[PDB]
Design a protein around this ligand. Structure first.
Ligand SMILES: [Cl-]
Ligand code: NA
Ligand code: NA
Length: 129
C-alpha cells in the first residue's frame, strides 16, 4: 500500500505514535517518507547483509526474522515479511520497542539525517487528525 502523507499521519496517530517517547507525529511521518516513501512493501538491503522492511524500514539485524541475516536477533518476535502488510499495526508495535530502547529515533538513519533538527510539524500541515 502507498499511503498519502495525511493518510499515514492519521494511521500513526490512531496506533499511538503521536508523542510516543516524546516524538511528535511529524517525526514519524518525516521518518516514514524518507525511509519507505510511504510504501508498506518497501524493502532495502543494508551493506551489513541485513534488510530493512516496510513503512518504517525495520532492520532484520535486531528486530525481525528474515532467515538470511546471520547473527541477527528478532527482538519484535515477528517475521520481517509480516512488516510489509497494508495494515501498519506490526510495524508500529515494533517501532515502539525500537524507540523505547535508549537511543530514541536515532535508530532510524533517515530520521537522524533528514528529520532531526528540522521543522517536522510541516509533515502534518493540512491533515485532518
Ligand atoms: Cl529521546
Ligand atoms: Na533477524
Ligand atoms: Na512542500
Amino acid at each position: 500500500k502507498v499511503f498519502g502523507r495525511c493518510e499515514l499521519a492519521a494511521a500513526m496517530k490512531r496506533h499511538g505514535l503521536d508523542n510516543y517517547r516524546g516524538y511528535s507525529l511529524g517525526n514519524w511521518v518525516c521518518a516514514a517518507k524518507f525511509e519507505s516513501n510511504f510504501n508498506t512493501q518497501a524493502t532495502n538491503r543494508n551493506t551489513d547483509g541485513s534488510t530493512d522492511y516496510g513503512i518504517l524500514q525495520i532492520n532484520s539485524r535486531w528486530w525481525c526474522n528474515d532467515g538470511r541475516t546471520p547473527g541477527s536477533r528478532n527482538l519484535c518476535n515477528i517475521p520481517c515479511s509480516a512488516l510489509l502488510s497494508s495494515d501498519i499495526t506490526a510495524s508500529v508495535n515494533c517501532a515502539k520497542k525500537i524507540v523505547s530502547d535508549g537511543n530514541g529515533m536515532n535508530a532510524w538513519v533517515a530520521w537522524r539525517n533528514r528529520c532531526k533538527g528540522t521543522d517536522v510539524q510541516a509533515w502534518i500541515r493540512g491533515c485532518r487528525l
